[PDB]
Amino acid sequence: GLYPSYNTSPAAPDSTGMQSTAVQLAGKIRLGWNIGNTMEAIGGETAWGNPMVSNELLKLVKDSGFDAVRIPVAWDQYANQESAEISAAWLNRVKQVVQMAIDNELYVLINIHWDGGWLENNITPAKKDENNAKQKAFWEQIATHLRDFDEHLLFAGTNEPNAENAEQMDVLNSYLQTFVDAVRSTGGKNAYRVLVLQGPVTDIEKTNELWTHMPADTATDRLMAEVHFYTPYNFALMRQDESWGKQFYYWGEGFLSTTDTERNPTWGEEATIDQLFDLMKTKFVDQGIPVVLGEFSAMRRTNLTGDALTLHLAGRAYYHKYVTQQALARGLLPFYWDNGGNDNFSSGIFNRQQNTVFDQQVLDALLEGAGA
Numbered sequence: 001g002l003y004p005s006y007n008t009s010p011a012a013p014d015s016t017g018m019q020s021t022a023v024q025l026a027g028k029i030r031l032g033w034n035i036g037n038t039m040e041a042i043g044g045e046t047a048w049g050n051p052m053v054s055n056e057l058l059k060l061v062k063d064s065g066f067d068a069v070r071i072p073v074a075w076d077q078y079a080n081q082e083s084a085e086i087s088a089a090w091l092n093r094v095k096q097v098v099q100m101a102i103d104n105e106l107y108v109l110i111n112i113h114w115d116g117g118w119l120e121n122n123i124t125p126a127k128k129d130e131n132n133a134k135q136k137a138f139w140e141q142i143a144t145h146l147r148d149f150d151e152h153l154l155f156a157g158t159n160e161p162n163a164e165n166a167e168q169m170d171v172l173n174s175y176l177q178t179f180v181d182a183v184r185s186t187g188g189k190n191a192y193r194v195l196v197l198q199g200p201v202t203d204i205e206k207t208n209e210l211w212t213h214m215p216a217d218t219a220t221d222r223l224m225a226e227v228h229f230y231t232p233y234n235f236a237l238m239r240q241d242e243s244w245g246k247q248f249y250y251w252g253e254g255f256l257s258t259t260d261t262e263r264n265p266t267w268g269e270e271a272t273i274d275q276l277f278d279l280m281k282t283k284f285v286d287q288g289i290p291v292v293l294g295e296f297s298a299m300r301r302t303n304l305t306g307d308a309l310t311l312h313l314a315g316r317a318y319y320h321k322y323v324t325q326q327a328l329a330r331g332l333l334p335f336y337w338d339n340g341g342n343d344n345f346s347s348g349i350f351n352r353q354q355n356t357v358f359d360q361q362v363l364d365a366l367l368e369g370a371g372a
């Protein structure tokens, strides 16, 4: 008993406003937005250049055409390290954001994120016991505090747990079980609440490879799976060339270069996306388990100039359209990764300072990709 029980006021099970199964819940969602670099930012909510989440932002997200938000959250840095007690002020701040998103009729998914790495980088036997205890303490607290929200609120137990092999996968399964058990033991609406569980590294391939069973649940048909998508790295996030490969500036049929052809994709084009998303359709969607596509986006390269810029941006725009559209086609619910930035190598499509659209052309792609 490393930490005290934070399961202090467990309520009676309450199905009020928790009527939708995972699958029904998932039919209500077709486009999602991440509040990236915000509630997970190390040093505080405003420490990574974004301002505090405001109702105005959430209204803009719903106005702009999204159905749900994913709110990565940091926790470890706000908790007493001897007792694993999380600051009541932080807890009230998270509740406040959840309440506002739901006031804007958004679905909401709250996680524990990388969060300084305590769990996410430590899916190993040596850390399993201490991590299991912290996972339980935090989740008891988190779910207790958020217990009364109806089915607009989902929980996701981890972010991108670094499980690379079967041994690490079994540790990750443990972490997911504790997350389920923690949440359910607090009762109330948390007995029926749709929970979201993460594939190893949220990587499609390693999930297909290593995943086995959902954790056991007292609830019935109340679990989703989660993967992320930044394929191919070279286009989506690569910022410099390495010896092993070059950055892709361009992507998609119609938008490849003929002058600088070395910045066209050598891989990770349309068919591959089709193929990976098919792996998850088979493993989960067709077994009646929706898949959250929790993060995707390809960064802007505004350090380009000229014909180069114009081409890049056309390809970037289509990539988001294609991923949005092909994920939906196969039962994956796509959530755009937005780190708030409007500068180079960033992914913000809103201007957080002004509560306005910065990147209409990418917002258009996600929308056309959902609206079709």
Ligand SMILES: OC[C@H]1O[C@@H](O[C@H]2[C@@H](OC[C@H]3O[C@@H](O[C@H]4[C@H](O)[C@@H](O)[C@H](O)O[C@@H]4CO)[C@H](O)[C@@H](O)[C@@H]3O[C@@H]3O[C@H](CO[C@H]4OC[C@@H](O)[C@H](O)[C@H]4O)[C@@H](O[C@@H]4O[C@H](CO)[C@@H](O)[C@H](O)[C@H]4O)[C@H](O)[C@H]3O)OC[C@@H](O)[C@@H]2O)[C@H](O)[C@@H](O)[C@H]1O
Pocket: 036, 037, 042, 047, 048, 049, 114, 115, 159, 160, 228, 237, 295, 339, 340, 341, 342, 343, 344, 345, 346
């Ligand atoms: O200090 C934190 C610590 O973080 C460690 O990396 C881990 C951490 O990444 C944060 C980055 O997350 C990106 O999103 C990821 C998402 O969370 C994952 O789920 C997804 O799989 O992968 C995504 C990868 O893309 C997010 O897009 C990144 O922005 C973020 O990086 C942090 O960004 C902030 C904000 O500014 C930058 O982005 C916005 C731009 O407009 C701007 O131009 C950029 O500079 C950075 O803030 C800065 O902090 C430095 C510190 O000195 C100051 O110099 C600067 O003034 C201040 O603005 C921040 O540094 C950067 O970390 O969480 C996800 C995990 O996967 C990563 O491993 C690093 O290893 C540590 O070294 C350390 O930074």
Ligand SMILES: [Cl-]
Pocket: 267, 268, 269, 270, 271, 272
């Ligand atoms: Cl390809």
